[PDB]
Amino acid sequence: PDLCAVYAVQVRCKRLDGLGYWSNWSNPAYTVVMDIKVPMRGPEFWRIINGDTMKKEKNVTLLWKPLMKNDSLCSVQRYVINHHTSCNGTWSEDVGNHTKFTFLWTEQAHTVTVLAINSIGASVANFNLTFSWPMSKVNIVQSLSAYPLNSSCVIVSWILSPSDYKLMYFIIEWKNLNEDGEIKWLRISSSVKKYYIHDHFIPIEKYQFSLYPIFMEGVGKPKIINSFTQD
């Protein structure tokens, strides 16, 4: 089941015809943790946009988490970010062991892909995210609401308007408005309409919940709420 765990193996032998006993086990042989295949799936990444609305150029900081043993298999030597633009074409920038990378967004459409590379090669299944200025104005989430079940779970529900664009998946972004905590995000399927976010939530403190509709053309206009619905 696991291709990168240490396995103890002991072997013993006897005659095929069965006349006798069965001997004791041999010395245990242990596998050496080495790369067997290329990584199965690339890391999920999200963007932080730093820039005034009056500026055409915005700093996009991509944050991704290190891959688990299921996705990284054995290890990830480095991460490389491949860019896709209508003007500059396709180029790849090596990030290395860093889990964050800041670049500049200037063009109308920019596709970003993250690949995890080990001693054998790059990852097979890699997530791509498209940044598009016209697509940022498309809003399909008619309404969004949050209900605190307790300090450890919050129900987030949304009602969507019909859209001509193909909706791929949702990305829920939440953070604390009373503290300078890290901006948390989670990728959910587009067919999901209500989700149970399990985190330490304080009902007194205000939490900003942002829902980002993701499409083939790019990220849609997020629906943002700043407090739990008391109705």
Side-chain angles (χ1 to χ4, degrees):
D2 193 6
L3 309 180
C4 313
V6 187
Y7 279 91
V9 173
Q10 295 188 265
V11 183
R12 49 193 197 172
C13 72
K14 219 256 315 231
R15 291 175 57 183
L16 185 58
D17 63 335
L19 295 183
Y21 329 96
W22 213 271
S23 59
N24 41 5
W25 297 101
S26 60
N27 297 331
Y30 300 93
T31 61
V32 184
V33 182
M34 293 180 298
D35 295 331
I36 282 102
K37 299 174 184 179
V38 289
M40 303 302 301
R41 182 173 296 183
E44 301 183 1
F45 62 99
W46 182 236
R47 59 164 179 183
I48 291 186
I49 300 180
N50 303 329
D52 194 8
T53 58
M54 309 301 298
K55 296 183 177 181
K56 300 180 181 180
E57 315 180 355
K58 293 177 176 179
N59 298 329
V60 178
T61 300
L62 311 155
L63 313 176
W64 56 92
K65 296 184 178 181
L67 289 166
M68 302 179 180
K69 291 187 176 182
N70 296 21
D71 299 329
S72 60
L73 294 188
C74 308
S75 58
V76 168
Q77 287 185 341
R78 61 184 181 272
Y79 302 94
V80 174
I81 290 179
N82 295 26
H83 304 267
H84 174 267
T85 48
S86 59
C87 179
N88 304 330
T90 60
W91 78 95
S92 60
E93 307 184 25
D94 201 334
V95 197
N97 204 20
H98 310 82
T99 59
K100 56 180 179 180
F101 179 76
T102 303
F103 72 102
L104 186 60
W105 181 25
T106 65
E107 300 190 18
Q108 294 188 0
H110 195 170
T111 306
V112 175
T113 316
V114 179
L115 330 173
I117 304 184
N118 68 329
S119 61
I120 304 183
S123 52
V124 180
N126 302 269
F127 298 97
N128 44 4
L129 192 53
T130 304
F131 312 139
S132 182
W133 303 88
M135 207 54 183
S136 59
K137 307 176 183 178
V138 180
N139 182 26
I140 76 170
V141 184
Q142 181 180 358
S143 63
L144 181 71
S145 300
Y147 327 103
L149 283 182
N150 46 11
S151 60
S152 61
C153 181
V154 159
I155 302 179
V156 177
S157 63
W158 49 90
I159 304 180
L160 312 165
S161 299
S163 180
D164 303 329
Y165 304 99
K166 185 176 182 179
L167 175 73
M168 304 177 61
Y169 56 91
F170 290 110
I171 292 185
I172 290 190
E173 163 176 335
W174 70 96
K175 65 174 183 178
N176 200 339
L177 293 179
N178 301 25
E179 302 176 349
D180 296 330
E182 298 181 355
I183 296 179
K184 302 179 182 179
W185 59 272
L186 185 54
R187 174 199 301 250
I188 330 180
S189 179
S190 59
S191 60
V192 185
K193 295 184 177 181
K194 57 171 185 177
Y195 193 81
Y196 303 87
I197 300 183
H198 295 72
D199 200 5
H200 296 70
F201 290 107
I202 298 180
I204 294 98
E205 296 182 354
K206 302 179 181 180
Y207 291 96
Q208 175 180 350
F209 299 96
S210 301
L211 176 57
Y212 288 81
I214 315 296
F215 309 90
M216 288 287 300
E217 299 86 3
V219 179
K221 181 179 180 180
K223 191 68 176 182
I224 302 179
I225 55 178
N226 299 330
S227 61
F228 305 99
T229 58
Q230 213 173 355
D231 288 357

